[PDB]
């Protein structure tokens, strides 16, 4: 996250970090004790998930690390056709997480209400991704409130194709944005003190560049699939 703030301990207890060939290469969100939702391009290789993380370089005794035993990319994901379209995947953990003030699921409304909450126009993104374009990754979890950008403005910002179940978010003058390493993490909307997952952090061009926006997957498009595959 470029131009964000340090999250306080337990401020985004649904956030997880993914470790693979490189540590902290993507984020994710807790759906329930056994399941994480992330971007499919992140898990397209052995992965471990860390819940309850705040500072990736210091043991705070709130962390819960788990092995991923199953990866379910959405059946319409095909990286050979488009790396970032239908970009959502689920990870099943070897042992359940223990829910507490540092490890708590994100709410997921039905298709209709997830779209209504996205249209409130203001969401929170978080992750340990790059804090500058081509820069270092964060040690403390970062967060940023990003406004939703209208589709017409979004389409004019890039030569790449923005599908209808993707959305743009960010600032007209850049300076603040998601970045590589935040991908797969959550875009959430606060509804009277309860956060709901409204997007997956997906892709973009130059982080925080004026005229460019972060691109996100609409969670409303995948709610039935998430609830079907993650049923306990």
């Amino acid at each position: 996250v470029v131009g964000g703030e340090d999250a306080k301990p337990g401020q985004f207890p649904w956030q997880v970090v993914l470790n693979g060939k490189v540590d902290a290469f993507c984020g994710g969100s807790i759906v329930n004790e056994k399941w994480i939702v992330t971007a499919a391009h992140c898990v397209e290789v052995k992965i471990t998930v860390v819940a309850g993380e705040h500072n990736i370089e210091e043991t705070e005794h709130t962390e819960q690390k788990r092995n991923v035993i199953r990866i379910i990319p959405h059946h319409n994901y095909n990286a050979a056709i488009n790396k970032y379209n239908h970009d959502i995947a689920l990870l099943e953990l070897d042992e359940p997480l223990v829910l507490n003030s540092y490890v708590t699921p994100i709410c997921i409304a039905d298709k209709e209400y997830t779209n209504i909450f996205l249209k409130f126009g203001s969401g929170y993104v978080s992750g340990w991704g790059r804090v500058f374009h081509k820069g270092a990754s964060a040690l403390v979890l970062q967060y940023l409130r990003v406004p939703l950008v209208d589709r017409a403005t979004c389409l004019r910002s890039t030569k790449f194709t923005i599908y209808n179940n993707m959305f743009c978010a960010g600032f007209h003058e850049g300076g603040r944005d998601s970045c590589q390493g935040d991908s797969g993490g959550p875009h959430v909307t606060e509804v009277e003190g309860t956060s709901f997952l409204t997007g997956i952090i997906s892709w973009g061009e130059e982080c925080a560049m004026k005229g460019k926006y972060g691109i996100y997957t609409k969670v409303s498009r995948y709610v039935n699939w998430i609830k079907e595959k993650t049923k306990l």
Binding site: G10, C107, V191, T194
Partner: protein, 49 residues
């Protein structure tokens, strides 16, 4: 009186009004608000900030 105006005054979900809440919450005494029904309900911060 209707979900199409102020969400029928429901804190979370409305149905034509009958208010409802997401899993881990129950409909409060006032039939509009949502309150925790489990120790750690989804989407809430419980550490002191």
């Amino acid at each position: 009186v209707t979900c199409n105006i102020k969400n029928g005054r429901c804190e979370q979900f409305c149905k034509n009004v009958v208010c409802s809440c997401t899993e881990g919450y129950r409909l409060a005494e006032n039939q509009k608000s949502c309150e925790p029904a489990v120790p750690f309900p989804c989407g809430r911060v419980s550490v002191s900030q």
